[PDB]
Amino acid sequence: EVPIVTRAEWNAKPPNGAIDSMVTPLPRAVIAHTAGGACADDVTCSQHMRNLQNFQMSKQKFSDIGYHYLIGGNGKVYEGRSPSQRGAFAGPNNDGSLGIAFIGNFEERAPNKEALDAAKELLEQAVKQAQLVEGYKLLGHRQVSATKSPGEALYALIQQWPNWSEEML
Template sequence: MRSLAALLLAACAVANAQNCPNIVARRGWGAKPAKTVEYIIKPVHNVIIHHTVSPICTSMNSCAERVRSIQVLHMNNLKFEDIGYSFLVGGDGNVYEGRGWHKQGAHTRGYNKNSIGIALVGDFTDTLPPRAQLDALKKLLECGVQLGELSDDYQLLGARQVVATQSPGLALYQELQTWPAWVEQP
């Protein structure tokens, strides 16, 4: 048990040293276990951004509840093996671990084997996410590069660029187009 605690403490120290955002682990938001797991090869070259088209959450409790409900929807209704996204970013400024850095997601058909899928909790069709949510997304991307999870020259895409969807919402998509890693064509 002590070795597990030491390992967790070391992981937290590495995350803080890398200036990573606060990442709420699966246990922290009450995730159900995945039915099966497939791993992806690192570093990942594509990051695909989504929105959840749900009300925004502004506290850890409301965000954890929202993430749990998304996992239930994905597993029960869509018959996914787990929540589809690699990470979800709440309006509270926290990042919620979905499948994480190492496991293949189920977020963007045809791109799951070579990408990380990040969903911002909320509907960003007409309005931008709060600054804390955008800042947490930026820090997560920087953290991924620093940890070697994302390639230095990763490509940032809105889901609408690669599949028939309106995600990540027009307002958020226009914001992403101003970020350095955004590319017009994958």
């Protein structure tokens, strides 16, 4: 199990705009990075969460922060969209996908061990909670969207995780 910093606990805004529904448990999990600054304490990670939500809602015009979960460099998992709400990270490939973004840019260095542990524990938890199917496909963001996300270093790691699938969408 892994604790979740709920939307209220990071002082999220509610969505502004409808979000399409998805049927859980979801067949796929998609690992992204936010590509921005890293965060290393509870104050900055919480602030990065609000800043990302505000940027995506205000500039990208998403209905909400685009991911279901985000993982700070402090090792904490922050709640985004509900798993039964379609994410906004992969356009036509949003369907059936649990989006988990590591906060930071992991092109050249890996996330902190605490963040990686948190992600593995989160996947296990998502399966146990019927958010994610047991026989899930684990994908990097780059396999479903034209992007470098989740960054070379993080992508190399997730390819080694259970259920990583080589499919390119």
